Amino acid sequence: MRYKFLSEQKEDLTEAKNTLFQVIEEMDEEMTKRFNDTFVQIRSHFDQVFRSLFGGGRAELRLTDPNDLLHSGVEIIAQPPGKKLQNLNLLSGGERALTAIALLFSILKVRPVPFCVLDQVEAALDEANVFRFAQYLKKYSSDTQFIVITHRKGTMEEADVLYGVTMQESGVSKVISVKLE
Amino acid sequence: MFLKRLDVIGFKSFAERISVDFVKGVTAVVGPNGSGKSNITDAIRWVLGEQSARSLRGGKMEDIIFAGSDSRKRLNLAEVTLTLDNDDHFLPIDFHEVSVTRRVYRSGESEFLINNQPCRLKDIIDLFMDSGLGKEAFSIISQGKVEEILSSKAEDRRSIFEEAAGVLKYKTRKKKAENKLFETQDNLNRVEDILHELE
Amino acid sequence: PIEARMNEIVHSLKSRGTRINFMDLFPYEQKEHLVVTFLAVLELMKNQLVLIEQEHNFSDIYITGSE
Numbered sequence: 108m109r110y111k112f113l114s115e116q117k118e119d120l121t122e123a124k125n126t127l128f129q130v131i132e133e134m135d136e137e138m139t140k141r142f143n144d145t146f147v148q149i150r151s152h153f154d155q156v157f158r159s160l161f162g163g164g165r166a167e168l169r170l171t172d173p174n175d176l177l178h179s180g181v182e183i184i185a186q187p188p189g190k191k192l193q194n195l196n197l198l199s200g201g202e203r204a205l206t207a208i209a210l211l212f213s214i215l216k217v218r219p220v221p222f223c224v225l226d227q228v229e230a231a232l233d234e235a236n237v238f239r240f241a242q243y244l245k246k247y248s249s250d251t252q253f254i255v256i257t258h259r260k261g262t263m264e265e266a267d268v269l270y271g272v273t274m275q276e277s278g279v280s281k282v283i284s285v286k287l288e
Numbered sequence: 289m290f291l292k293r294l295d296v297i298g299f300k301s302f303a304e305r306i307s308v309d310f311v312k313g314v315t316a317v318v319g320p321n322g323s324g325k326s327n328i329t330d331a332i333r334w335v336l337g338e339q340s341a342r343s344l345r346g347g348k349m350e351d352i353i354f355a356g357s358d359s360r361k362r363l364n365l366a367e368v369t370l371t372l373d374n375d376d377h378f379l380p381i382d383f384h385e386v387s388v389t390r391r392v393y394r395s396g397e398s399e400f401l402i403n404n405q406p407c408r409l410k411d412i413i414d415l416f417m418d419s420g421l422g423k424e425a426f427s428i429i430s431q432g433k434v435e436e437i438l439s440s441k442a443e444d445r446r447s448i449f450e451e452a453a454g455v456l457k458y459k460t461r462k463k464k465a466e467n468k469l470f471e472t473q474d475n476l477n478r479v480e481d482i483l484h485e486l487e
Numbered sequence: 488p489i490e491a492r493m494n495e496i497v498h499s500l501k502s503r504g505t506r507i508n509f510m511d512l513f514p515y516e517q518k519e520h521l522v523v524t525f526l527a528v529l530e531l532m533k534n535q536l537v538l539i540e541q542e543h544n545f546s547d548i549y550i551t552g553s554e
């Protein structure tokens with residue numbers, strides 16, 4: 108037997124499908140355009156941010172598949188000063204960490220924030236590179252307040268103030284503070 | 289806009305009140321390993337409405353509230369208050385200084401306040417989302433982000449660029465529509481099966 | 488490096504039997520030195536070897552031996 112309520116349910120399905128399909132395609136359009144637009148902007152800063160952190164060299168961003176703007180990966184190719192230009196996959200541990208930080212700081216030029224909490228992001232930097240990282244922060248702290256959790260002494264040396272967190276009593280953190288600037 | 293003060297009481301390892309006054313430039317947080325300096329980051333995430341337990345390095349009530357030590361018995365309340373300078377009206381609130389407060393009680397009850405007025409978690413989340421400081425903003429960056437960039441799977445790296453592009457709300461709406469389609473078809477399928485057993 | 492400075496604060500406390508101001512530990516300290524001194528005091532506090540008094544953020548800090 109055929110039922111009216113079932114036939115209406117099938118018509119409601121067909122009707123919703125037509126609108127929902129249009130929602131989905133517009134979402135796809137927004138994601139492809141915004142991804143590409145933002146990628147272009149981040150790429151525009153990347154070489155300069157890399158160079159200021161490494162003190163030299165050069166670097167590039169490239170879409171893995173530029174005709175698949177919904178799924179393409181991003182290739183990072185970088186040349187630390189004194190080394191060859193290579194995919195990020197083949198750089199040293201400390202070079203990889205600093206290049207990733209260069210990408211994060213390039214994103215911050217495109218999508219600025221009034222404050223930025225960095226929790227030990229520079230843990231894997233080679234010691235020789237810490238001072239340019241720390242000086243980057245001081246320089247651009249005119250536009251972004253930086254709150255930096257760190258165990259690298261070079262980063263501490265460029266901060267304006269230090270908060271020390273230590274357990275004087277067992278399992279209870281105490282906080283002291285000293286100005287440097 | 290900038291962070292003025294972080295007040296922390298009973299949150300994780302901060303058994304008694306601490307109060308961090310930030311400067312406008314670079315504030316560094318330092319100290320021996322395990323002594324709690326990354327609980328500062330967790331407290332900032334938590335009061336701004338983070339609910340991911342992974343993001344909080346422990347986000348359940350027993351992780352949030354000071355659980356006790358040799359030095360002290362556990363507490364029954366954790367509280368964090370972040371005070372922000374809003375002189376430039378970066379946040380859409382008609383107040384010179386904006387305070388956000390989060391509390392959780394051992395009993396499981398939670399309280400949220402903006403400028404000492406009770407509100408919902410959603411009101412804190414929406415306040416920062418509307419001003420460009422939501423989930424996709426890079427206002428809090430831990431080592432996990434570096435790991436995603438350095439990942440060998442291309443989906444992990446693309447994710448960083450999608451956050452920067454602000455695509456999450458479009459992706460979520462697309463998935464919401466795809467789920468509506470699926471569940472509508474599934475309900476019809478189940479109705480037809482019930483009806484078919486009636487024949 | 489830090490444990491070097493830790494001992495030099497420990498022994499410097501055995502002299503003055505009273506409070507000592509953090510900046511008095513090393514007169515006209517430079518910031519690279521200040522940082523290690525600061526990290527040293529933190530670790531000494533952690534090892535239950537020194538007591539710290541500070542009234543407000545960025546107010547003067549006084550340090551006293553423990554045992």
Ligand SMILES: Nc1ncnc2c1ncn2[C@@H]1O[C@H](COP(=O)(O)OP(=O)(O)OP(=O)(O)O)[C@@H](O)[C@H]1O
Binds near residue numbers: 278300326346354
């Ligand atoms: N509810 C809690 N109650 C008491 N102490 C807590 C609680 N949650 C976390 N902690 C304590 O706070 C401290 C956290 O230390 P901290 O964040 O400085 O560095 P960490 O533990 O080494 O983390 P990471 O590995 O990410 O660097 C630990 O001693 C931990 O046991």
